[PDB]
Amino acid sequence: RNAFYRKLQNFLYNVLERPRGWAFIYHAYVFLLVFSCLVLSVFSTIKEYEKSSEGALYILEIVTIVVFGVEYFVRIWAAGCCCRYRGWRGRLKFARKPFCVIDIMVLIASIAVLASALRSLRFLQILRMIRMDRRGGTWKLLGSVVYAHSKELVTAWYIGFLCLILASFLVYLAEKGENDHFDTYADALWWGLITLTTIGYGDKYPQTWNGRLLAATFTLIGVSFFALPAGILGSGFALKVQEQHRQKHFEKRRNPAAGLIQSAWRFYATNLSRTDLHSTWQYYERTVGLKVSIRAVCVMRFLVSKRKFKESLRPYDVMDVIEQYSAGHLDMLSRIKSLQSRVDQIVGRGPAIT
Amino acid sequence: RNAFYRKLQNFLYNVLERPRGWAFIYHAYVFLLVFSCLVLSVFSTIKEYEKSSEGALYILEIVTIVVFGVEYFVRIWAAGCCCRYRGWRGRLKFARKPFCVIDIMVLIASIAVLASALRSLRFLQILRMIRMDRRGGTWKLLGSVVYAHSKELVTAWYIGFLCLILASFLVYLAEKGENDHFDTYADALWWGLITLTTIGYGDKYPQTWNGRLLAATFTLIGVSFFALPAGILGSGFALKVQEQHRQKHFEKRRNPAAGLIQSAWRFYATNLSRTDLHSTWQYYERTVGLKVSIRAVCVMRFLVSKRKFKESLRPYDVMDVIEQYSAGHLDMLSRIKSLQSRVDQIVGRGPAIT
Amino acid sequence: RNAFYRKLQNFLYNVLERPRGWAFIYHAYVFLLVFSCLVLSVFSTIKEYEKSSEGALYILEIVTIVVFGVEYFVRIWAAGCCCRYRGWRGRLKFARKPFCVIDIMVLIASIAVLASALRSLRFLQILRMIRMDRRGGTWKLLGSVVYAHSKELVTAWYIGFLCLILASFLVYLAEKGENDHFDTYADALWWGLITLTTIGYGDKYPQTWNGRLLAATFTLIGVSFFALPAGILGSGFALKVQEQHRQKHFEKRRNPAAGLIQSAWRFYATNLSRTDLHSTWQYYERTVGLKVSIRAVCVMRFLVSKRKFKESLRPYDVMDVIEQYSAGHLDMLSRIKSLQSRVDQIVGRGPAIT
Amino acid sequence: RNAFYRKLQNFLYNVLERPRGWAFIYHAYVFLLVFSCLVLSVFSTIKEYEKSSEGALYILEIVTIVVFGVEYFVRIWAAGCCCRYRGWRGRLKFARKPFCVIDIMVLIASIAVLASALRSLRFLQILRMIRMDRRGGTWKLLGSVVYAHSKELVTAWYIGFLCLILASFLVYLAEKGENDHFDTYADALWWGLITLTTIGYGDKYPQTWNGRLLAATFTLIGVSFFALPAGILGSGFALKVQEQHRQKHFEKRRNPAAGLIQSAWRFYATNLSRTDLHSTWQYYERTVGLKVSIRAVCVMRFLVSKRKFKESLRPYDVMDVIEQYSAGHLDMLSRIKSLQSRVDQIVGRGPAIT
Amino acid sequence: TEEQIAEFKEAFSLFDKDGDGTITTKELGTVMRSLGQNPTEAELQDMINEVDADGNGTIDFPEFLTMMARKMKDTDSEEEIREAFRVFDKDGNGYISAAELRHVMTNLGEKLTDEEVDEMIREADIDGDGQVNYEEFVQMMTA
Amino acid sequence: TEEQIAEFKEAFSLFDKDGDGTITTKELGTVMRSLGQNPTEAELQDMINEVDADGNGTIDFPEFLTMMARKMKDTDSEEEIREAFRVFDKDGNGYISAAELRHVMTNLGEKLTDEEVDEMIREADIDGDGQVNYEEFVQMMTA
Amino acid sequence: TEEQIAEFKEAFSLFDKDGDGTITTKELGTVMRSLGQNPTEAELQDMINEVDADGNGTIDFPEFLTMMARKMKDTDSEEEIREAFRVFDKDGNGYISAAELRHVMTNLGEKLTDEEVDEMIREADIDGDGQVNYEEFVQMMTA
Amino acid sequence: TEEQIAEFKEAFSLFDKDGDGTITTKELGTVMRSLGQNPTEAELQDMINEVDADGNGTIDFPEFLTMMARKMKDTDSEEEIREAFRVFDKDGNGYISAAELRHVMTNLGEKLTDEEVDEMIREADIDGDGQVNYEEFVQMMTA
Numbered sequence A, B, C, D: 001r002n003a004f005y006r007k008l009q010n011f012l013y014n015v016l017e018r019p020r021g022w023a024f025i026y027h028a029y030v031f032l033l034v035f036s037c038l039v040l041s042v043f044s045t046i047k048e049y050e051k052s053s054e055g056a057l058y059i060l061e062i063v064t065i066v067v068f069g070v071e072y073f074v075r076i077w078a079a080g081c082c083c084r085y086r087g088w089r090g091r092l093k094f095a096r097k098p099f100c101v102i103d104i105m106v107l108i109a110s111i112a113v114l115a116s117a118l119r120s121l122r123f124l125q126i127l128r129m130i131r132m133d134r135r136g137g138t139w140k141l142l143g144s145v146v147y148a149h150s151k152e153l154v155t156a157w158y159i160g161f162l163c164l165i166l167a168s169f170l171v172y173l174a175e176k177g178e179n180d181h182f183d184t185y186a187d188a189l190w191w192g193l194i195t196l197t198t199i200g201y202g203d204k205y206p207q208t209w210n211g212r213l214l215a216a217t218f219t220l221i222g223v224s225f226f227a228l229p230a231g232i233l234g235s236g237f238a239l240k241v242q243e244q245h246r247q248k249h250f251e252k253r254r255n256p257a258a259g260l261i262q263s264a265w266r267f268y269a270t271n272l273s274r275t276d277l278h279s280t281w282q283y284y285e286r287t288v289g290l291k292v293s294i295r296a297v298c299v300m301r302f303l304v305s306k307r308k309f310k311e312s313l314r315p316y317d318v319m320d321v322i323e324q325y326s327a328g329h330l331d332m333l334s335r336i337k338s339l340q341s342r343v344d345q346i347v348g349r350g351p352a353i354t
Numbered sequence E, F, G, H: 001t002e003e004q005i006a007e008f009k010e011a012f013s014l015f016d017k018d019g020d021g022t023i024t025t026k027e028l029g030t031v032m033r034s035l036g037q038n039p040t041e042a043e044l045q046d047m048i049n050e051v052d053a054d055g056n057g058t059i060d061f062p063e064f065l066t067m068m069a070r071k072m073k074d075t076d077s078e079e080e081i082r083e084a085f086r087v088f089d090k091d092g093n094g095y096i097s098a099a100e101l102r103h104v105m106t107n108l109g110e111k112l113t114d115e116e117v118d119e120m121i122r123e124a125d126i127d128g129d130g131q132v133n134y135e136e137f138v139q140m141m142t143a
């Protein structure tokens, strides 16, 4: 079982950890559990139905704390998947993660109330869904795009601010007395923001057609300006994902290059005189004529990996025309090298016939 | 007529089937028929005018069921256009399509009520317009773009969710007692969603200026965040269509390549010794010195197709600079090959004068 | 004056006609005239101020009809700028343009009422601003982008339609009796459209929290879907304008190529034996040893234009690397041609020393 | 201290002036000061809290005028950082900037009222935040994108205008008598604009289902059209920033080229005979065998800078394939030059053995 | 061979409808209709062009016999046809399925018959897995 | 020919206004105005430059006679002018209509007269369909 | 050397399981399992292919001794492996940290042991700063 | 010249602080501080590297005299420096204004003094319009 012991720990934790296949299946579903738990937590917030609300909601609360307490422990052991952490030191060392500690804090509070907590109970389920991330790559991705677009965004934000301030103030002095709505500058600022975002509550508006003629321009500007940063950041994502697709072809290229050099040093360490190079010999003797056989084993695996890295990059539009460039150019070079050979034999028979 | 019989079946079904010319003309118009039928089906839902509504609506219902029942049959026979389906087996075999079976199911229900069905009648006309697709390429195209943008979308969705939850809860505790509007957390959540989407019904809003100061920030964030995924997917389509335009030039290139190899094997099968290669001989003898003539027929058509594929790709910006690359580089190669010939004659007269 | 007569006609009509410099100055200003005329035409639609409204509005009406009647005539004569139209036939021939005829029709109606017409008066000023285009390139540009994006748009339109229909119908059966608002399916459809476009009038909404839970999802989908085609077409323009910028560099390249061949045939027609080539000789003799001088005149202008077209294209990123490609590649070719010369002299002295 | 005197003036003014590191830190914070001052200036506009509002607001007003008066002076002296301005003439010359003069004007008014000014006080704080720019690069960036997109924008603006006019007028004649809302064409135009921008105040709407059928189409068009220019300009920024990223790699390339030629002329001016070239000699003798040493000093710094500019451009996708182009092509050229040497020696021994 | 020469003269007279000693374009369209096809006149032109040594607009018996005596290995289109194979093997891994081959040979260019594509795969599939290695097949056909 | 030499000396003295033995730029602008055109001074400069063998700023009679004796087939711009033909045949198929040729020759560069463009197409259209094959026309003109 | 020849014959018979005189693929997978690895059959094939001089599908002792006698400087992959070094030194400045080397050698390709990567850096770091200059290391290994 | 040799030995001993016969990096930083500059040690290294014939880490008097005897036309960087001129003439038309030259020479790289850039333009502007033709100036300096 120990073979399966480490197999399941490693592979199933990599699923549990950063996955690539179908780990989001489990993760989206446990998401659904805790999230729907939250929803029915709000379902208790309907007095007409809150009774049955709690009636099933405490059911779901039991389910939730069970799910994430066991997730705590099982992620612990499955983290035996990690080479650098195996046993006492490693897993009694890595537990001091802030994500982990807030995990156990909220979870022990969960079992405590699972041993009038409605509000903070909402907060802890909140922290569960927050726990979905573990990496902040959301914020990382965002701030990247933002800083990438910093001067554009500041442009929009500034000019929109000015339209808001100006037009609001103007109409405040446009319907100062004809409407109880617009009676303080605080009033108008509420109106300006509620308007320029195209929300349109309706609880205020101008009636003096002069004031209406004020808004009936500054709206045309501001509302679009407020609509910009959504549109900008939306594209900004789109552009980023396209170009990253292209580069993705290269990282595919990179891993075969990424491994061939491994076999390269695996070749160099194979000298019988290089007993100081005990790295691969101990790797083999631990994975254990035959030793020179093992030399040929690793070194020949290096040679085959050599052609492997030769195919590390397959295509890419500019790199693909790099390759077709390679075709015509290198075929030419083959031909020129031939002509080199021709001139070389002629240089040899220069003395041969003289 | 049998020549016209199969001609009309084949070509007019390809119109009826996946078209490229002007088949959408007929298809949009029959769309208009069934759709306007639906509209007047709602026109029966105005009591002031529902009487005349049904008065003409049953007219349109007759028209509709006629149209699609005949479409069922005529698509059947026109599907004699299909090589793999010709007669008993083929067309008595392909009818088991789910699109086809739901077609006949809804249609036989149509003639049944065309022999108090208002609600499900609406449903079956619904299924007609659903029947417009036959391929789900709508959903296919969508999910492609979505999965392509998965991490971006999840970013937006998550952070927008958090703004919604937080700001709604806050203002709920910001105007807890000053407004009958905001009286349960269910209340606020209705308000949050109705607001952050910039709908602005108006039936709720904050009046305590402290609460207004709450919303007057979280709106500025959330409303844009909710506005993102529209903007993202809009571009995502735009980018996809541009790059697919470029590749479209290549598929134009690809079909002439796509056919020349056909004539290539058409050449190889032309050996009189290759009687085992009875493919083209039976193709000709079924389409029927003269047989060696037919050899030259197919084989020479292959040679002309050889230059045809030589022109398979005409231009493309990177491929076009590939071609101009070909011009200068290959002209150089012509020149180097000349110099090869020069060195070769010199290598020949090395012995000639020695 | 006749020199200035045709000079002013030609150049000032090209301003009046398709311009490139500062003709939009005049055109935007006459736009302002007629447009502000329209606005005050609405200003008559305020009974509190309509009296003074007409008081100055008829002022502006006089101005408008004056402006465009004189524009009719002056565009006529300035169209003497056109080579193909000069005098009786040409300008008594081109007047039959539909733009021109609707021009004179609306304008003669204008002077007729300028010799209770409020409504159609609005219509004719309308047709004036419509007259701003003369080319429909608005519609042309639009339909281009649309057809370019056809399948994307149909995707969005279809799926949005389905959300509208489904969610509206559902909530209609979700608050069928609890609200006088939602009392006919016509009611809901009004509500669905007013909502999914994020307009939010407020005059309807769900109160049964079950019905609110219906909308509180289908909104999240539909409103974004309805927000797509704006975002798509917005980018679609943006992408189009970028790529057209790049190609613009080439058309700059193209005109010098576009003229050098002119001088090319100008060279060929210069043979004294080519008296049949009376084209340039009559061009010169009409623009009038000296005739062989004129030969050298046109032919040498061709040669200088030859280097002119040599500089027809200056740069372009891919074309610019085409040029730097030209630098290294052609320098190499210069060097290979040298080596050609070397092998050629060696081939000559092969016999010289043998 | 004079060394530190000019050091602090120069570097800390470049921070104060166009920065690249962390000057926005100070600038955003002083922004926060003046801006929050503005906010509490509005805080005086709440009668329930205006008393304490002024109570702390005059505190902040003292802070603000202090901040920007000292900013005036300290920017003056720190502008001793500027080479062209050092002492009497320079700093008594540059002060006549319009930004500077409006600065001192508003600021002296500030200290004047800091020696019933609420409204214009708001205006002067306004001008402070306006003072944040100093360059108008906001407007510059905007107008660039706008003119870049001019014809697209005019397309959208025009067609949206037409939808607004037409649909508004129609519904005005669609519910002319059934609603007190729609009673003048001015009424409808207010409704059209409030609608097509998706604001949806709610204070007007159609009830005659015929009129509702009018709006329930022209909305579907217009609202998207009004939503375009936001989406367009949003992308327009995004595209601009991407392509400018690429070019940014080149300006990085450009500065090392930008300096090597400096050392180039620094070499040429080093001739002892070129005493007329007293530029570098006086630069050194002012920065002061040894003079020929200084020759080698500057000239050798030129040579090292020569390889520096050789590395001026490091990579760029097309330029990077330019470089890999350089690799294969130039390696080929090395090889061809070798073959040149071969033919040259053969041309030399042509006579040697003949 | 002399019998090859006789069969080629026989076929030439077959295309040599009017017996002038060359095969004009009209006899070519004629014989194509006799075989059953409607070749466009520019089509018969290019056939002459790649058969017409002199370029006279007719296929003389000289050009006839030269074509009839030449083999596929006498055509010089190796890497060309290999790229033309590469298109359908979009992955470019050397093996295109008999599936894609069969399907596209049923609906692209001059699509052949079932036995036509059948012998195509049988000669193009020699190892027996349907996956049609294409560069091997061009190597086998071009030699 | 000697009569060619005489006509070229005659035209040279025509440009040789001051009779110095070379054609300076001033006589060039002078003779251009005499013909009727206003050539910019840099324009006359480049004419000298491509005529001025020595590079003196004047067109000596040596350079004059050499230009006057040289033909269009003595100019070496085949593929250049062919690309310059290609631009207007945007499709690049070898045939540009007499329509596009005529129109753009009426509104591009030194647009010619009707008979100018007319003889242009008559020499550039030799088969009689208005569609002006351009590489044939450069081949015919450049030889 | 003769003792080299003897050790190579010894190892060959070790791979020469059935003793036929060549090392078929089956003995290769066998000896790989004996060493402990599960090499795919195509893997053993390519090993033969780059060892199989004749191309018979087995590694004869001729091919065995030739490989066993050849050195790393007898392999001709200088700039290849240098590019393969360049990948991990993404900056391409000649120095990759022992950090990145160690980490990726722990989680890429056939990741080695700690002492394996340790000796890797010790031979690849010769100056003693962890930053592993890679072109020096290929220069040292390839000679 | 012998007096050139003497001045170069004099300057060498000036850099030859310790008098060993070569100019180590320490004397180079020393003499740079004596002149007033703070050159980084890698900077003095590259100076040696492009002066150090042997590559010893010191500038022997051999390398000293060879540099001191070599001229700018003995450096082989024509098209290099011309591209480096091209950067500031962003239009690439051969003429960069004395304005852009002066300004950027005041705020780029080792910006010089007013008379430094002044003599720069005076030698780089020889026709007298401020617009500094750059390829002429490299042609004049490099010969």
Ligand SMILES: CCOC(=O)Nc1ccc(NCc2ccc(F)cc2)cc1N
Pocket: B156, B157, B158, B160, B161, B164, B225, B226, B227, B228, B229, B230, C220, C221, C222, C223, C224, C225
């Ligand atoms: C493409 C279909 O249309 C949209 O995806 N639109 C949309 C969808 C969600 C959100 N917010 C995140 C959220 C998601 C689910 C929830 F239950 C609550 C919040 C915002 C927008 N604009």
Ligand SMILES: CCOC(=O)Nc1ccc(NCc2ccc(F)cc2)cc1N
Pocket: A220, A221, A222, A224, A225, D156, D157, D158, D160, D161, D164, D225, D226, D227, D228, D229, D230
């Ligand atoms: C970039 C600043 O913000 C906007 O340009 N927005 C915007 C501007 C105009 C329109 N409609 C056309 C129109 C223009 C003027 C008029 F007087 C009447 C109609 C729609 C939008 N969305």
